[PDB]
Structures are given as structure tokens and as C-alpha cells.
Write a protein that binds this ligand. Sequence first.
Ligand SMILES: O=C(O)[C@H]1O[C@@H](N2CCN(c3nnnc4c3sc3nc(N5CCOCC5)c5c(c34)CCCC5)CC2)[C@H](O)[C@@H](O)[C@@H]1O
Ligand SMILES: O=C(O)[C@H]1O[C@@H](N2CCN(c3nnnc4c3sc3nc(N5CCOCC5)c5c(c34)CCCC5)CC2)[C@H](O)[C@@H](O)[C@@H]1O
Lengths: 582, 582
Amino acid sequence: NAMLYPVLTQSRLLSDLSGVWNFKLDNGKGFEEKWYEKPLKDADTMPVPASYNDLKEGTDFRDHYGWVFYQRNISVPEYVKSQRIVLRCAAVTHYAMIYLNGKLICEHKGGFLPFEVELNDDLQDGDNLLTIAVNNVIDYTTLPVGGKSDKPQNNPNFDFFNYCGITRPVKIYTTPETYINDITVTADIDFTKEEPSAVLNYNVEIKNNTCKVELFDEEGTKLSETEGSEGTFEISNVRLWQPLNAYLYKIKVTAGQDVYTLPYGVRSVRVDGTKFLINEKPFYFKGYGKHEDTFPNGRGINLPMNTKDISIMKWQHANSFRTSHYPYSEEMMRLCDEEGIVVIDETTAVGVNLQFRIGTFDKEHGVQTQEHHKDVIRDLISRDKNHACVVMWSIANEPDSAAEGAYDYFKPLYDLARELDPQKRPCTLVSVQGTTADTDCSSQLSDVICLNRYYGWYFGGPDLEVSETGLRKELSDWGKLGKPVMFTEYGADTVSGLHDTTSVMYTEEYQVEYYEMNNKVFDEFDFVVGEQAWNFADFATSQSLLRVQGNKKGLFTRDRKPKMVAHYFRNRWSAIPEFGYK
Amino acid sequence: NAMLYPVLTQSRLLSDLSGVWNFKLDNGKGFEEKWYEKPLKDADTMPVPASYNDLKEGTDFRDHYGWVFYQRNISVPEYVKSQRIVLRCAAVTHYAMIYLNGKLICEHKGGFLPFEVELNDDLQDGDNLLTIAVNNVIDYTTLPVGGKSDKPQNNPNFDFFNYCGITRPVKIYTTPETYINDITVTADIDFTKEEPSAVLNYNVEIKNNTCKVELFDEEGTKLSETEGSEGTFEISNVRLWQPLNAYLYKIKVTAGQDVYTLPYGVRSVRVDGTKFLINEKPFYFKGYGKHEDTFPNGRGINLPMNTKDISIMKWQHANSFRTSHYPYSEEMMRLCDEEGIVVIDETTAVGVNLQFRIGTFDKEHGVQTQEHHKDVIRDLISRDKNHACVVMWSIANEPDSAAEGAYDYFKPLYDLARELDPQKRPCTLVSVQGTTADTDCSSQLSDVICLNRYYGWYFGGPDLEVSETGLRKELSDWGKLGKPVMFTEYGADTVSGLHDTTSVMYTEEYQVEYYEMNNKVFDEFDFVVGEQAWNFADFATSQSLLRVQGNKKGLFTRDRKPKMVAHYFRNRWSAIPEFGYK
Ligand SMILES: O=C(O)[C@H]1O[C@@H](N2CCN(c3nnnc4c3sc3nc(N5CCOCC5)c5c(c34)CCCC5)CC2)[C@H](O)[C@@H](O)[C@@H]1O
Ligand SMILES: O=C(O)[C@H]1O[C@@H](N2CCN(c3nnnc4c3sc3nc(N5CCOCC5)c5c(c34)CCCC5)CC2)[C@H](O)[C@@H](O)[C@@H]1O
């Protein structure tokens, strides 16, 4: 359906269940022995939320295959049974199974978007046993996609480690028996007037059954009031949320005995040939593709680092960033609203490429994700549709875009995408290397062409000259489409500390020369509408000859320390405006 | 008074207020402009809990002198006013001032122990403005102690950076109008019987006015019941909480409409000449002195790293660790109970040494901390007295133990210490270098002699031979006291990655040779009862010629990566039992 970010409102409530839960690894027999009923014997300690792989020693934990069992003592005073009581799981990666006192109540497939379940009718009073059971297996039926010796081990079709567990927080909140279930505010700005202003349309609806909303500004001064399920809210000379200059209005939808408020930003996003326009102005993407990766948290949420990364980005003179290869935490999404970081939202659709002999979209011996793929496109837009920060959506990362059955697979998702977006924001998919304008189904399905090209590493490296003409060749060909092309990934593995006057691959010097060259070409084409480096920071992958203790293509280290190229970019972007770059 | 760790019990409640609050740095005029009343203009974003210094860029933030203002929207449904409502601040470092809707309600001096205040009578309904204002100034009236150019800047008398802000979590809980305010369980074990068992004494008392408690075990099976304010609870063949083998019983004190439960471990601690005995067995301390230091969290609580450190310690074959130079978070204290980590609790009493010409305890131009020093000795034992993990207390780190007025300053605190400990656990103070048996007031006030000697770095380095005879000389002299001496600090700064076949200072090789030498001597004296290296991991200090980007004496890096010496110790302690080392 739809899901609001639980907060503390007079109407509802909220208690963070996160702490150090009881924990045990599945041995196989664990399910039929019904460990979810009783407590867990010979248990271990495990903080929540955080992916568990890197919080114990030895390969037994890090590379475990199968199920893990979290157990937690839940308990409530009776005067709360008064109200709706809910259990919102912001993200237990992959598959989740919840037992309370010994009975499976909820289940989810997808480890990067929330899901909830109410407890009032099965919530016994006294000591209650909550048992979330997570599984880490990836195959052709999951997004992200896992591929195919002795003993079992997941083989990911993506280039980043497979951190699982309760990645984001577990909490309990409560609402009135008739409660708000979903807001939806849109906007049409009338840049008509030299001094502009506009009006917004709301769309509440509840779940017994009055309903009418109040409007505020940054500091808290009220500016209007109205009624209805789907009315208007005119504003005169409004402050447009802009990149690196966020203004957020707030909304107090008071209805029934329920009150919940919502921060909102007013901004316009629409493409026009080869120009990405926010607030009817020509933008340029300056930033990087990043990851929810820290140590030892794994993919577990780290609010401090979140703010630290945003500071570093502002320090570096950036504005954009694509969401990894999966939806990010809600706290980060909102934080980008307050700080004004234009964000590209991506689905957990990475791995839809078997060209790494059955084809990707072979309908019997191949991918089996279109269905679930559609769910996340629903559950994600259902979650962040009210974020001024989100300027665009990307349905998949590096899929077999130029293979038979590519169109017949994506257009259904594109349609569902641009149909559920209450703002009809642009949609795109970042194509892998080896795609051509005349070859990529994204040339027609997408509004913005976003490439993952690496001319200087995989291609041509270390010959930066032949690599240059290469990118120039492919780049100009993309101009024939007459639409905006932006690089969402270019980079080169470099080990911080390795220096050389005449650079070679993996040195800090080479990384700078690589970005110097590519950027030189990017600046030759007025239809290139933004550069995003891969990656923001070194992150953990799975072991292999081609990974020097994880991925080292980041501009910063895993501990957020700047490599030399981080300064090169801070200088270059220093001399590049958010608007008017042409 | 006393403070329990708030949890989710049928009786009470708990909602974590921690998130990303509104934030502003004080400009001076901020207080008279009364920013606590209104919201905060031109505000910034700052996650809570975490010390704020390292979460923005530029020296303006990191080295700020003075006040910071946190602001947060607090809000509650009326059906809760039913119950006691409380605001527990686990630790806003240094001085804290709380305003609600614009009125200062609570204040605290001390940034490493909790403090609470109830809100029911001034908690307006609707949108409420909470404003915690923190100050970072240190002087001769604070613990830790700050000493004494242009523009103001704190000068710490301790060797670690001055991370401040809301270091530990902010939350709200609720109790019944008559509630439990303090438990107190002691134990006498009758190792009489070849197969032993014992009985425990409880001590509840409330704050209107029945009262009688239930007892359980690991899994949840009940074993007894009784009544009274100060009764007994006999157990037969009980599992003694032991180092690296924790057994924790649980207690359900049901009284009035209030229920709160407590985990407890049964263990015996008593000194006998030159032998530290836990459960009437001769122990040996194997571990390190550590810090609440991570990046970029500052001193902010990091539950994931907590478990990660504990895993590394188990991986390394350790058992002990002294609490830095200040009390640690409650979550960590409890986690050591579950994992069985014997812990030395230390006060924020570091900096009581002005020999770094008025004397330390000069009663007019010198330290002014004895009073506040006594409060923390009260507030800390009031907090962790029920922790089987805590085997000992240390009242101060490296004070001027051998100066006039030393005795007259510490004995009052020692007395208050061993008088409020409901278990009469040993007390000690770690002496600085330059102290002698015949010179240190700790030779009489303390039960265990714990040295901070560094023969091989500050003394003698790099001449490891002369440094050896040096330590041998001072070490044997300490034998004359006929009591247990344990090194709580020995180490040597080394930059991970710097190697050399013939080692020199700051190389990994030297660090190993240093520990090799000192350990060789430690093993010569049957009255040395444990080695703790300084430090567990590299941590942040303030800048100076003698600090290579912080402190680098750790066995691991700041990101928890093992230097070569981390393996040396894992091997040595590998061959050293927790008991019977002599
Ligand atoms: O890898 C990274 O760090 C990041 O890159 C992106 N993805 C790029 C495409 N893909 C690849 N991964 N690994 N190797 C190659 C590709 S494509 C390619 N093409 C190649 N040749 C044709 C193109 O011209 C040059 C020659 C060659 C190689 C590769 C490897 C060495 C031999 C030549 C998956 C990763 C992902 O978005 C990102 O998640 C990942 O983290
Ligand atoms: O410093 C660390 O890393 C850790 O050490 C501990 N503390 C040790 C004592 N103290 C010192 N800090 N810095 N320098 C010296 C001392 S004492 C001393 N004595 C010295 N001479 C007499 C003893 O024989 C050798 C010669 C010399 C020096 C020092 C410095 C260089 C010149 C010779 C405060 C720090 C703290 O518990 C810890 O918090 C800190 O982090």
C-alpha cells in the first residue's frame, strides 16, 4: 500500500525496539525444531539494526549460507491496547518471517523497503517473544539477483558484498482505530509571474470515519487551512526547494483523533530535449553513486555517517547522488530534503544481466523477477513520492538492456512507474558498457540517458589516449538521440597511499588522470547533463582476484578519508554551477 | 540517587528520542536572545546521539569553544499523562541545560553518567519544544580537568580529544505514580560445599505504597518467590558468572502496578595478599585499556562497534578492560555481563595532576574537584553496582598521587567508595610514572596496585635493554608491598604499515619488541596479576607535535584493523589461562 515514516505525534506513538537482541545461526533443523516458539539456546549477542556479517569473527559468520534467528523480548502496558498497535520493519534484508509468542504473523520479500503488521489481536500481555527470522539466499527470483566446489555459498550477480540481517530499525508505534494511512501532495508552480508562486493539491484518506489540513513554514507560522479528501492549498511568493538550498514547508493534517505532519518542498522537474530542468532551470548533476556501506555496521543504518557524508559532499561542492543499487533508509531520504541534495532513487533491480547459453529474459531458464520487480516499483514510489529531493527514478542498474525480451520486460515497469508517480518525474535506467544508442531499449523508454562507462580502466586502461577517443566516439553517438545523457558511473580502483610521479593503475595519481581525461570530454558536449563518479567511498565486495580487499574505486576511503582525487573534484566542481553550465 | 536502565516492561514504557535534531552553535548572544524559547533560525542538522565535533567540516565546528544548542520537537498523546513521564539523559557531556517550551527544567554537571527529570507537570499538550544546551568548557572545577595566543580554546589536561554533545541516547519512559526506584542484589557464595551454592539478598524500595519478587534463569524457568523490602533468595547449585563464561539470572520484582526485571550474575571478588580472586580463584587480567572512540561518531555511542570490539577481544583471547578514563555507556556495561568480560570501572577523574609553581591540591590556586569527584563516585556506583562484570573501581587516572595533599584528597573518596559499594569490591587508582611504593598514597588506600608504566617508549626508548632493567627495578620494589600489582597501561605509538627488519620507533616491529620485553619481566613476578595494554585501538587526541594524527599506541587501528602486535598478543594470551597462572 502506502507507508508513512513513523514519528512522535500527539495522535500516534513510537518506541525503538532496536538494541542487542538474542541471536542464533540456523543449522537447518532449526525450523522444524521450532526455535521461534521457545527462546533460543546457546544464544549469541547481536545489535539491531545492522547487518550481522562483520560483527563476529571467522568465516562461519561472514559467509554463512541460509537462515539467522533474531529473538527479542517485547512487552507493553495494557492501557496502550486502547490504540492501534503496529510493528514497522524498515528493512530486514531479503526474506523476513515474524513470529510472536510462537506464531508466524507477517512475511516480506525484499530487504530494502519497509513493511508493517499490527499486533493488538495476537499481542498477549506479559512477556511476549518476538522472533524475526532472516534469510540471505539470492537466486533468479530475488532483487538483487544471485547467480550460480563444495558446501553452499551465495554467488551474487552484483559487485558488492551481501550484508543481510535487520539492516534498518525495528520499532512499534500506535494510531487511533481510524487513522491516516497516506498523504499525497503535488504542486504546479506558476513561474508565470516574474516573482513566482503556486498552489499545492493534497490527497489524504483514512482507515470508522472529519478531514482538513493546516499549513506552516520553516519556523512554525501557519499560513492557511482547508477541508476535503483532495483539495488545494494556494501559496503566494513561495520558496522553491532548490539544489543545495532547501526550503521545506510543513503540513498538519488533523483528522479524527489522529494528527500527523509532513515536511514538503516545492520544486519543478521536467526534461526538455537535452536539458534537465529543476524549477524551470537547466541543472547539472555533480556528485557520485554511493552505497550504504560502513564498518563494521555492514549495510546497517548509520545516521552519524549519513550526516558526515552530506557534509563531505557540501565540502566537495556536490549536489547529486544515485542511491547505490537499492533504496536507501528513510532517515537518509529525509535528510537530503533538509540539506537539499538532489537524489536519484534506484530499485533493488541489479543483476538482471546474465551476459556475465541462456539469455537474460529467457522465460523458463532465466530471470524470474518481473513480478517482484513491479512490487518494489510500487512500494518505493509509495514511500518517497513526497520527497522534493528525488528528481528521477531508475528501475534497474546495468541490465541486459540490449538483449531480446528487454523491451517486453521493462516497458511494463516504466508504465507502472510513470503512472504511479503523483508528480510524473523522469524515469531512467543506467545501461552497462557495451550498449549503443541504436541498441539500448532505454533510448526509447527513458527520459534521461545515464551511462555506466569506464573508458580508462576496463576499457583502454592504462592507455588514456585511445580510451579518450573511445569515449568521444560513443559519447557523440549518444547525441543523436537529442535527449539528456549523464554519466552515473566512471571511476578507477586506486589504493590510497600508493603514489608515483609517472602514474600506473591503482595509484592516486592515475585515478586523477583518469577523471581528468573523462571530464575533459564530458565538457565538450552541451547535452551531457551531469557527472557522477563511482564511487563515493570504498566499499566491501565479495572476494576475488579483481578486488583488492573490496572495491577501491571510491574518491574517499571506507572511513571517509579523502584520496587525492577527492581534492581534484572539490576544485573542479568548485568551478561549476548547479545551473547554467551552458 | 539511583538510576535503573530503562527497558520495555508491562509497567513502564520507552521511546527513543534520538534522531537528527535541529542544531546551532552559540555565538555568545544566544542565551540572552533566549534561543531556547523560540525555534532556532538558520539551523543545522545533527544526529543524536553522537559528539558533534567530527560531523561537519572546518575547524569552526571541531574546535568550537562554548555552547551548542540542540532543539527537538517533543509531542505525546494525552492518554499517557496517565502515568509518570520521565526524561532520562544517558550522557550529555560536561554541562547540560534543558528547556521545555521555553523554561529550564533540569541541569547536570558531568558528561559520562545519566540524569533524568519528569515532564508531566510542565509537559504542555500539542507541539512541545525541547532544547538541550551543551557546553564544552573544561577547567579546574570539572572532571575531566581542563588546564590553561588569541581567541578562546579549551586546553585539556588529558590525552584524548574533547568530544562533546549528546554523547549517549535521549529518550522518554513512563512509570506508575508509585514506582520502583532502585534494586540492590548482593550475594554470599558458600564455596563450602564441593558442589557449591549460595543465597542472594535483595533490597527494593519504591516511591502511595505490596512488594515481592520472583526469580528466573537464562531461559525463563522460575525458581523461587518471596516478599519484603530486604529479604533473601536461596539458590542451590548455582551457576557462577565467571570470566568469559557468563551465567545471568533474572529477577522480576513485581510491586504495585509496576514490574521491572533485572539480570544478575553470581560471582565472588576478594583480594588475598598478592592474588586477585574471582569466585575464590586466582585470576589474571588479560586485555587492554580502551576508549569510547570511533569515527565519525566521536564519543557517541556505537552499539555495533561495541559488539565488534567484544568479538575481537574474544578472538584475541582476552578477558579484561579498564573503562578508558570515564564511565562507559550502560549498553556496553550490560553487554559485558552477557559475554562475561571482567571490567574495571573508572571515574571521569583524569587531569588531577598539575605537575605537567602551584601544586595539584593547593586549596586556593589549584584543583577544585573533590566535591564533584564525590558525586560521580556516588552516581556511578549507584548505576553499575549490580554488574557481575565490574570487579573493581578506580577513582582517578594518573593523579598527583605522590604530592602533598594527595592522601587528604583521596581517602574521603576511597571511604565513600568502599562504603557505598553494596559488594565492597576492591578500589584502586592507576598511578602515573614516577611513583614509588614508598611514595604513592595508593600504596595504602588501594587494594590493587595498578601502574601506568612505559619503559621502552617515554623511558629508555629505543634502548629496550636499559628500559628492561628499569622496569625490573621499579617492579621488584613494588613487591615489598605484599599486594597485587597489575599494569593497566603499557604501549608504544606505531603507525600501521611502517615496517623494518631492524625496527625503530613507530614501526610495527618495534611495538612487538616493546611488548615482548615488558611481558618478559611481567612473567618473572608471581605478584603481577594481569597485563592490560594501552591502547585497544588508535583514538583521537588534540593536535601537537607528539601525536601523529591522534594516538597510535593501539593494538588495532581506529577502524578495528589488527596491527602485527595484535597477533603477538593473541598468541601469548592464547597460552595464558584466566586462572591458575601461578
Ligand atoms: O566494477 C565496479 O567497481 C562497478 O562497476 C559497475 N559495473 C560495471 C559493469 N560490470 C563489470 N564488472 N567488472 N568488469 C567489467 C564490467 S564491464 C567490462 N567490460 C570490459 N570490456 C568491455 C568494455 O570496454 C572495456 C573492455 C572488461 C571488464 C568489464 C573487466 C576486465 C576485462 C575488460 C559490473 C560493474 C557497477 O555499476 C558497480 O556496481 C560496480 O561496483
Ligand atoms: O600517552 C599516552 O598515549 C597515554 O599515556 C598515559 N599517560 C601517561 C603519562 N602521561 C605522559 N604523557 N606524555 N608524555 C609523558 C607522560 S609521562 C612521561 N615521562 C617521561 N619521562 C619520565 C618517565 O620515564 C621516562 C622519561 C617522558 C614523557 C612522559 C614524554 C617524553 C619525555 C620523557 C600522560 C599519559 C595516559 O594514561 C593515557 O591517557 C595516554 O593516552
